[PDB]
Design a protein that fits this description.
The structure is cut from a larger assembly and holds three copies of chain A. Chain A has 638 residues and is an alpha+beta fold. Chain A is 51% helix and 9% strand. Chain A folds into two domains: 1-490, no CATH class; 491-638, Four Helix Bundle (Hemerythrin (Met), subunit A) (Up-down Bundle), CATH 1.20.120.1560. In chain A, the strands form five sheets. A five-stranded mixed sheet of chain A has the order 1-6-7-2-3. In chain A, α5 (145-164) runs parallel beside α14 (400-421) and α10 (317-332) packs across α14 (400-421). β9 (231-234) of chain B pairs antiparallel with β1 (2-3) of chain C. The complex binds adenosine-5'-diphosphate (2 copies), L-methionine-S-sulfoximine phosphate (P3S) (2 copies), chloride ion (4 copies) and magnesium ion (MG) (4 copies). The PDB classes it as ligase.
Chain lengths: 638, 638, 23
């Protein structure tokens, strides 16, 4: 009765009108970001030279140079009528006017440099609907930025040093991250009419470019550009109502920050367009999941993709050195990566419709492949896609950082290692070949889902872990620690948290899913089943008493059966839920977060599918006239 | 429930207001297309002379000359405010902004010549709502263009040569294709509240120029002219809510590309006018299906319809020549054509309401006919219509290319063939005389739907095939091969694949139909049926105790029987669906696509009608007040 | 049946024309 108010609701939905600032991008791209182009303008001759010396790998920022900046910074934002400032920061999961009483007692607006939990001098401040946002690092380390920043640092020092063995120059090596954002959209109305979709982000049940949308994108993009994020492409995915959008790569940290922000933008904007953006990795069951690829590469300060072969690759010894290296890292750090992308949501995705199974294994592709013996296809975790590697394992909701923090530090180590080792001008070839032979195992090239590879790799010793809890545990696994704590990225106490808070999440997520599905079953689904069952009963009940037993026996036949069928399901559900409620109960009591997790993945998680199977069947039986929830057919097209 | 929210929805539907750019067509026609008229304008004195030499049969395009073009192209696209570019291409049944980071750190908009999967230097790029499109191919050939092109290439040379025997000149011979698009419209509102239709594109069940619409064509037409499709006509068809719309013949390729987009252009504009364009060959059962005619003809650079008789058809030996020739092609390549237009949907179409049966046979009509012995009514696949032939067989949803690929390549062959023979200045008459008597069997002129012919052909050896699977298989039969794989059109594998993906489709389509129907029945129809039945029962039940068994006997009668009638049907259905679901189950399991096809055609496909038959009766019985779906009577009028 | 006057001229450019041949 509300589901329909939804269908009828969207019968008419004039797609919003947009605009487009000027016809020249250059006119507004970055319009809303206090970037150099503008610090040079608004900041004092000196203060500016300082933001640079600081961002020029050097720093630090004087409490003096701060106010120097901060003041200039505001002056800019005022040009946008911003009236509040805030420390923007993504934690492992506040607006202030400038208002201030002056000496003379009169009120004034002021932004003290004393307000930079520490601003990431690296990422420019940006403005969103009257609010200056200062990217900062939450402080162990309760955020994501810090861990990354460090991870990225290590990678640099490391790769730079190892770069020395060639072109003596090369002061430093940067990390470029090009991400690809996938998602689904649902008309808000329909969405609300589906409680499991709200609250869980994914349908917990259910039997398996439009103008409206275009306009959504029309805006999103503009707003992104203004925000500095360089959105390059946008197209719709394999599944219904699924779409992607990717920008041009950017020094990892920024890239990430940017993506993070984009998700924000998308949500705010979507709502405005009477849509709901679904970022879960598996919104609808039985249809392409959503993923977030991470195209990784390492540009050196003197130039050089450092991952780009190009003409006679056997000659480009530098490249060879790095490629083979990556190989070792991906290989030597399987579990670590698979952990940086595992999540209650992603679990539902990887290992399926175009989603890499939890089995890391690089793809070099014939050409470069055989070439490695001398010493582009998806369906696989890592993949050399040409002058860069693409890491598909990542979920679509995850914060890139995680995946990067791992991959990068992991690489950092593997490098600093290759270096020490290759220290016994012609040695390289020794270690290089030593490593190629060493990796081998890790390299693959075919149907990554094929039952072929399922064992074909298990044989090589390549681990395969589906269970989130387990898969996660490996954060504390010695090898990982060697990389994480090794490279001074985390200290015991920290890594400890990380792993917990991570398990913590999973546990809750799995819980809510359960909680919801339980209530929805008992409160929404069942009550209907009954209602319909009555329809059926009232039928026989009368029929039976109007036809000769003979007639009634043959006419009621099937009907009578279905009633049984229904009564069966209902009861079944009634139980499963109870039992599940119990499971959760006990589970919730395991005196140890670490166990609590397993408890769920172990005994609770299972019911989710159990309960469903029934509901779904019921959906097929009951009258479409009724049936509380919007049906997939509608969530996907109607 | 919704079926009414529909009738009510369209009680008030103001037909949109259009405009009309200027009053001088010449003003806005081909406005959004980067045609030479404009290349000359935007392109450098030489870079232009290059795109011309390219499309002057010559080519190729320099990576340099590309960028040269590529840039002028943008300079233009901007005057229209385009901001994205994409590769427009029709694969076997994608949006980048110009954004670019400059050397000097600042952002620019750039369109590298490096972006021309290979552009069809031929068909001009066109702009559509801020998005520039570049017709391209899909390189094995995973598209339709490539083939067609190759196919057309052959026909050119192959015909230029034979042409040589006469007027020594004649550099080449072009192919003109004048299509004719048919369709149906349904008020979106009704549509949506009719699953089968949305999803299957055609009603799976159901018992058997308004302002709103004019406004549609009003806009549809303008947008075409702005785009270069020279739409010349638009009138409504034989059935309700059906309408044609045809352009002025253009070189087969361009002709095609145009149509192929007009399909898009329509679907877009359509929604905008609360309509849904139904391109399926047979939306509604029992009323003219939609078709797409292909008016073929060959012009030789030095003029000449080459299919144009004119005063004294004996003098025109060239014509006579070609005529006879085509006559052979249509005869010698029967099954090849039939397969180039066979499709799950079209199956429900041809061989009926003005649609040619699966029995290829030409039509010359008295005049040219008897006079062809000296050595226009529809109801017929091919039909010489005067200075051109008309290929009625084609479905209204197909990609003209398919039919052309055959037609042309076939002709190309049968032409080159003639040239062989006629190699022994007067000989031609020998060969021509041969083919004439040789074709014979293929000419016809009467009621093609006639039984006197449905058999009168079988005698002549004229093949007749309905079952898509079968009819398709012939793509592989050696004759076809001789022409297709023969003329460098497809290579052994390719053609093999084409037949695969083709069969693939058929199977998918048939499944989704079965899928749906199954649900709509059990799920939507049945439940109502019961509801009504109760009304009937509650009637008898009560009256059975207020009247003398005598009276009750006489009054129950009918009622009682209908109750039976209904109970019969609903049960009947419950089964067929079951049985059907099972059939599919199996079919689905045959290990080969080729098998799966015949599987459906043979045991799943058959059910669609069985199940239906009942539902439709039930429709007639149940109370109009109820009945979930919009009635045909409503879908075709009000 | 509705027909625009649309028609391709010799020069290839499009023009609108109504031929007496239509009466
Ligand atoms: N040198 C590079 N370094 C990092 N990322 C890159 C580099 N070159 C390209 N990329 C990224 O490759 C990604 C390609 O995205 P997309 O085309 O949508 O998916 P696929 O790469 O699977 O086609 C983009 O994010 C692009 O920025
Ligand atoms: N010389 C020609 N070459 C190709 N197509 C042509 C030629 N002459 C006419 N046509 C096409 O004949 C078609 C006639 O369409 P129409 O009148 O709607 O259907 P019918 O041909 O069934 O009357 C138009 O598409 C026209 O362009
Ligand atoms: C077609 S795909 O590989 C599909 C990816 C899949 N949806 C996933 O979740 O990884 N997307 P992309 O075009 O970014 O490669
Ligand atoms: C009415 S009709 O012949 C179409 C007849 C039938 N609906 C068909 O699809 O061939 N249109 P046209 O103007 O092309 O002759
Ligand atoms: Cl509830
Ligand atoms: Cl709980
Ligand atoms: Cl349904
Ligand atoms: Cl199935
Ligand atoms: Mg994508
Ligand atoms: Mg990708
Ligand atoms: Mg027509
Ligand atoms: Mg016709």
């Amino acid at each position: 009765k509300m589901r329909f108010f939804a269908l009828q609701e969207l019968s008419n939905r004039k797609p919003l009108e947009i605009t487009t600032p000027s016809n020249k991008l250059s006119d507004y791209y970055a319009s809303h970001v206090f970037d150099r182009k503008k610090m040079q303008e608004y900041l004092p001759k000196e203060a500016y030279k300082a933001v640079v010396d600081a961002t020029e790998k050097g720093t630090p920022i004087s409490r003096e140079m701060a106010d120097l900046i901060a003041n200039g910074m505001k002056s800019w934002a005022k040009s946008l009528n911003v009236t509040h400032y805030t420390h923007w920061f993504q934690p492992l999961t506040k607006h202030d006017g400038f208002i201030e009483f002056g000496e003379d007692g009169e009120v004034i607006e002021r932004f003290s440099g004393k307000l930079l939990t520490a601003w990431d001098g690296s990422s420019p401040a940006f403005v969103v609907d009257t609010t200056l946002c200062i990217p900062t690092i939450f402080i162990e380390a309760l955020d994501y930025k810090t861990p990354l920043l460090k991870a990225l640092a290590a990678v640099d020092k490391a790769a730079t040093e190892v770069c020395q063995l060639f072109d003596k120059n090369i002061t430093r090596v940067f990390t470029n991250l090009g991400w690809e954002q996938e998602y689904f959209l649902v008309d808000t109305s329909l969405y609300n009419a589906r409680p499991d979709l709200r609250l869980t982000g994914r349908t917990l049940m259910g039997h398996s470019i439009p103008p409206r949308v275009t306009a959504f994108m029309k805006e999103l993009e503009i707003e992104c550009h203004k925000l500095g994020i360089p959105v390059k492409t946008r197209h719709n995915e394999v599944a219904p109502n699924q779409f992607e959008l990717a920008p041009i790569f950017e020094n990892c940290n920024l890239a990430n920050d940017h993506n993070q922000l984009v998700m924000d933008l998308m949500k705010r904007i979507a709502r405005k367009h009477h849509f709901a953006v679904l970022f879960h990795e598996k919104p609808y069951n039985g249809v392409n999941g959503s993923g977030k690829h991470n195209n990784w590469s390492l540009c050196t300060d003197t130039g050089i993709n450092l991952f780009a072969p190009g003409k006679n690759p056997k000659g480009n010894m530098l490249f060879l050195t790095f490629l083979v290296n990556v190989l070792m890292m991906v290989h030597k750090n399987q579990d670590l990566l698979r952990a940086s992308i595992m999540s209650a949501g992603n679990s539902h995705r990887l290992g399926a419709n175009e989603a890499p199974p939890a089995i890391l294994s690089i793809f070099l592709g014939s050409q470069l492949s055989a070439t490695l013996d001398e010493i582009r296809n998806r369906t696989s975790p890592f993949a050399f896609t040409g002058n860069r590697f693409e890491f598909r394992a990542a979920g679509s909701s995850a914060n890139c950082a995680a995946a990067m923090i791992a991959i990068n530090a992991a690489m950092a180590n593997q490098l600093n290692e290759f270096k020490a080792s290759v220290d016994k001008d012609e040695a390289i070839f020794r270690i290089l070949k030593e490593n190629i032979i060493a990796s081998e195992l890790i390299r693959f090239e075919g149907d990554g889902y094929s039952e072929e590879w399922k064992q074909e790799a298990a044989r090589r010793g390549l681990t395969n872990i589906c269970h989130v809890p387990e898969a996660l545990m490996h954060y504390m696994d010695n090898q990982s620690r060697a990389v994480l704590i090794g490279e001074r990225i985390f200290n015991e106490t920290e890594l400890a948290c990380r792993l917990e808070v991570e398990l913590e999440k999973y546990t809750m997520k799995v819980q809510i899913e359960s909680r919801v599905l339980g209530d929805l079953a008992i409160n929404h689904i069942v009550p209907i089943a009954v209602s319909y069952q009555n329809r059926l009963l009232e039928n026989l009940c009368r029929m039976k008493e109007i036809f000769s037993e003979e007639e009634y026996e043959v006419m009621s036949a099937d009907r009578k059966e279905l009633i049984k069928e229904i009564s069966h399901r209902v009861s079944a559900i009634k139980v499963l839920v109870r039992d599940m409620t119990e499971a959760r109960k006990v589970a919730n009591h395991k005196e140890n977060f670490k166990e609590k997790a397993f408890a769920y993945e172990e005994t609770v998680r299972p019911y989710l599918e159990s309960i469903r199977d029934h509901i779904d069947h019921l959906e097929m039986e009951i009258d479409d006239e009724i049936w509380p929830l919007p049906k997939y057919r509608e969530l996907l097209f109607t």
